Amino acid sequence: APRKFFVGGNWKMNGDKKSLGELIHTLNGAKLSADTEVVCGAPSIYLDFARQKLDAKIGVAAQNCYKVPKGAFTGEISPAMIKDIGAAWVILGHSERRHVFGESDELIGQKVAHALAEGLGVIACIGEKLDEREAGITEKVVFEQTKAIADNVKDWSKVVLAYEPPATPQQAQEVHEKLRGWLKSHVSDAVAQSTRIIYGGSVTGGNCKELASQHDVDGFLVGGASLKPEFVDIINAKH
Amino acid sequence: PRKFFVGGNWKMNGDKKSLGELIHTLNGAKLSADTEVVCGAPSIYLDFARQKLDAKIGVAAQNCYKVPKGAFTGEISPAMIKDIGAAWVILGHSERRHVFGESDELIGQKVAHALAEGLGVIACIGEKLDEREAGITEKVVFEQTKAIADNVKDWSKVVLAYEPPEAIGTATPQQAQEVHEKLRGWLKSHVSDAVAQSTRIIYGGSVTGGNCKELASQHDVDGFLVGGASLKPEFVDIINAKH
Numbered sequence: 026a027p028r029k030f031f032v033g034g035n036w037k038m039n040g041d042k043k044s045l046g047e048l049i050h051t052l053n054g055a056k057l058s059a060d061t062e063v064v065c066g067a068p069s070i071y072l073d074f075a076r077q078k079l080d081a082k083i084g085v086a087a088q089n090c091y092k093v094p095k096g097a098f099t100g101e102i103s104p105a106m107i108k109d110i111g112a113a114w115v116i117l118g119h120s121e122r123r124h125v126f127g128e129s130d131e132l133i134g135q136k137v138a139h140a141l142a143e144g145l146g147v148i149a150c151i152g153e154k155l156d157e158r159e160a161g162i163t164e165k166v167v168f169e170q171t172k173a174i175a176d177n178v179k180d181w182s183k184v185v186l187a188y189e190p191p192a193t194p195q196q197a198q199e200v201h202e203k204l205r206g207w208l209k210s211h212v213s214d215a216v217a218q219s220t221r222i223i224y225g226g227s228v229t230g231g232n233c234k235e236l237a238s239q240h241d242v243d244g245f246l247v248g249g250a251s252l253k254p255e256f257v258d259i260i261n262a263k264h
Numbered sequence: 265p266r267k268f269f270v271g272g273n274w275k276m277n278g279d280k281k282s283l284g285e286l287i288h289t290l291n292g293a294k295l296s297a298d299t300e301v302v303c304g305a306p307s308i309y310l311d312f313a314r315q316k317l318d319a320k321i322g323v324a325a326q327n328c329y330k331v332p333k334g335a336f337t338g339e340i341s342p343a344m345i346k347d348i349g350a351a352w353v354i355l356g357h358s359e360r361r362h363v364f365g366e367s368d369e370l371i372g373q374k375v376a377h378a379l380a381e382g383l384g385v386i387a388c389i390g391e392k393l394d395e396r397e398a399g400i401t402e403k404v405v406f407e408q409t410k411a412i413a414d415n416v417k418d419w420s421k422v423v424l425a426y427e428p429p430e431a432i433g434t435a436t437p438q439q440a441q442e443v444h445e446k447l448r449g450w451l452k453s454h455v456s457d458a459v460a461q462s463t464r465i466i467y468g469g470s471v472t473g474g475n476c477k478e479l480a481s482q483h484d485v486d487g488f489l490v491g492g493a494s495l496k497p498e499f500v501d502i503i504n505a506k507h
Contacts, residue, residue, distance in 0.1 A: 038329060038336040041347040069307040070325075070340045070348060087308075089338030091276065097491070098276040099357040100327030100364070102308045109279040110308055119337040126338070127365065248335070 030058070030237070031185055031221045031244035032260045033086065033148055034251030035066040035116060045071055048252060049078045055257045057082075058264050061244070064148070065251070066116050069102055076111040086114035086148060089122060092135040094143070104143035115140050116246075118150040118174070120189045120225075130173035137184075138177035145183070148246060149174045150225060151204075152189030163200065168207055175208075181216045187246040189225035194235045197224050201241035230255035237262035268296075268480070269423055269464045269487035270503050271324060271386055272494030273304040273354060283309055286495065287316045293500045295320075296507055299487070302386070303494070304354050307340055314349040324352035324386060327360060330373040332381070342381035353378050354489075356388040356412070358427045358468075368411035375422075376415035383421070386489060387412045388468060389447075390427030401443065406450055413451075419459045424451075425489040427468035437478045437485075440467050444484035473498030480505035 040048070045067070057063060064084035067075040076085045091101040107115060117140065118133040133149075140147050151174070153166040167188070178184055188200055201222050209217035224236055225246035236242055250256055274283070283305070295301060302322035305313040314323045329339040345353060355378065356371040371387075378385050389412070391404035405426065416422055426443055428435050444465050452460035467479055468489035473496075479485055493499055 035337060037334065038331075038339045038341055039333050041344060066337075068340050068344060069338075070310055070344050072308050073311055093276075095277050096275065097359060098363065099273060099304075099354065099359040100307075101276045102306050103276060106279060106306060106308050116337065121335055121337040125336065 028219065028221050028243045029062050030060055030263055031062045031064070031223055032262075033064045033066060033114075033116070033185075033187070033223065033244075033246045034256055035088065035119070035246055035248055036068065036251055037088070037121070037248065038068060039252055040068065040071060042071075042074060044252075045075065046078065049075065051254055052083060052257070053078075053080045055260075057257065058261050060263065061260050063260055064114050066114075066148075072107065072112050073110045084114055084146075085112040086116050087112055088116050088119070090115050090117070090136060090140060092132070092139045104140045104145050107145060108143065112145075114146040114148060116148045116150065116187075118170070120150065120152050120191075124154070130170055134173045134177040137174055141178065141180070141183065146185070147183065148185045148187050148223075150187040150189055150246070152225070153191060155191040158191050164203055167200065167204065171204060171207055172211070175212060181212070181220050185221045185223055185243075187223045187225040189246070192226045194232070194239060197226060197236060198239040198241055201239065205241050228259060230258040233259045233262040266462060266464050266486045267300050268298055268506055269300045269302070269466055270505075271302045271304055271352075271354070271423075271425070271466065271487075271489045272499055273326065273357070273489055273491055274306065274494055275326070275359070275491065276306060277495055278306065278309065280309070280312060283313065284316060287313065289497070290321060290500070291316075291318045294504075295500065296504050298506065299503050301503055302352050304352075304386075310345065310350050311348045322352055322384075323348075323350040324354050325350055326354050326357070328353045328355070328374060328378060330370070330377045342378045342383050345383060346381065350383075352384045352386060354386045354388065354425075356408070358388065358390050358429075362392070368408060372411045372415040375412055379416065379418070379421060384423070385421065386423045386425050386466075387416075388425040388427055388489070390468065391429060393429040393432070396429055402446060405443065405447065409447065409450055410454070413454060419455065419463050423464045423466055423486075425466045425468040427489070430470075435469055437475070437482055440469065440479060441482040441484055444482065448484050471502055473501040476502045476505035
């Protein structure tokens with residue numbers, strides 16, 4: 026009945042076999058809470074390596090994918106390829122994809138639909154721009170982004186929503202509560218109660234316990250700290 | 265002499281089983297010793313491809329970013345490509361320019377970074393169909409080449425790939441030769457005589473087992489960047505287009 030705590034580590038564009046090997050060694054040897062679902066998001070070039078080296082209890086995510094299984098899309102990878110390597114998740118709609126690479130809500134929706142149809146789990150990311158937060162339209166913006174994802178989700182069992190603010194723990198709770206309210210009204214009470222909504226702002230060993238104590242925060246999508254030993258402490262934030 | 269160069273761009277195709285089969289075929293084929301062969305694999309399979317391909321065959325990434333590390337979810341860097349043992353990256357492919365909106369400026373920044381990091385670059389240029397129809401092919405490809413050239417210090421590790429636009433139902437070896445000769449003339453005056461003489465300019469249009477010999481006989485065509493046929497048995501014949 027309770028939502029299982031979920032901690033994803035987004036390595037972003039970082040690592041080589043040496044540094045990631047050391048990272049993976051530390052995670053494999055660490056005492057990790059049985060009550061946390063852990064997923065590591067590796068650069069595409071290291072997905073195979075990461076899946077081979079990581080203990081099976083730790084999931085592997087791709088950091089992006091495209092919206093069809095194959096084709097004339099030089100530089101892209103598909104859910105079929107991600108599954109072929111043994112990864113079970115993909116991060117979609119990350120703030121950096123939206124803002125540096127201009128990925129639209131429409132495209133992200135198409136990717137979500139395809140990844141889910143192909144049997145992957147999706148960490149679906151949403152978050153408003155700084156100017157939008159300053160203008161007081163956080164809710165309007167994140168609801169639009171969430172609707173664009175939701176319209177492409179037939180089954181929420183393998184979806185985790187990640188909120189990335191452009192930020193206080195109280196401010197985090199406020200957005201998470203509003204997002205869960207959106208799910209309740211626009212999808213169902215069952216989906217609202219069961220869907221993990223994870224926090225994708227700045228998460229460190231210093232602030233993770235306070236964030237994890239918030240009623241509507243179900244875990245984290247961790248950035249820089251996911252490359253460091255303190256990722257273990259973040260996984261164990263509730264203990 | 266300009267060594268004949270054949271790159272096989274697999275694009276977004278394959279899995280370990282199917283790419284393993286295609287690699288096994290290449291490893292066992294009678295490939296001309298006078299062709300420099302490079303296979304362009306999806307990023308997720310670059311490590312695999314380098315492990316399985318004979319050392320004589322190069323491996324290319326299909327794209328990369330412009331710094332070694334950072335907050336660029338979904339991107340890979342030249343440092344990572346080198347880490348995997350690959351020695352090439354394809355940059356500025358028509359699909360990156362068109363589908364993904366990569367600018368001349370960004371492509372130039374990527375070229376400069378990949379070269380600084382010690383990779384070879386297959387630098388792609390080519391006009392859109394509407395531009396070819398307007399008769400401004402030359403203007404467009406020179407603009408794109410300038411953006412690349414401004415970011416190349418040593419041309420020894422660059423191969424230039426010309427991609428004519430796909431007809432989509434609405435080209436000739438002579439037409440390929442015409443563009444390649446113009447590009448070489450551009451290099452002569454904008455870079456140097458030596459760079460024009462030594463730089464491979466490869467053809468990235470529709471290359472098949474059936475048209476490859478005629479294309480390879482053109483005076484200013486130095487090889488191919490092969491799309492669909494790189495997934496077919498005839499890729500071996502294309503590698504052997506001079507013979």
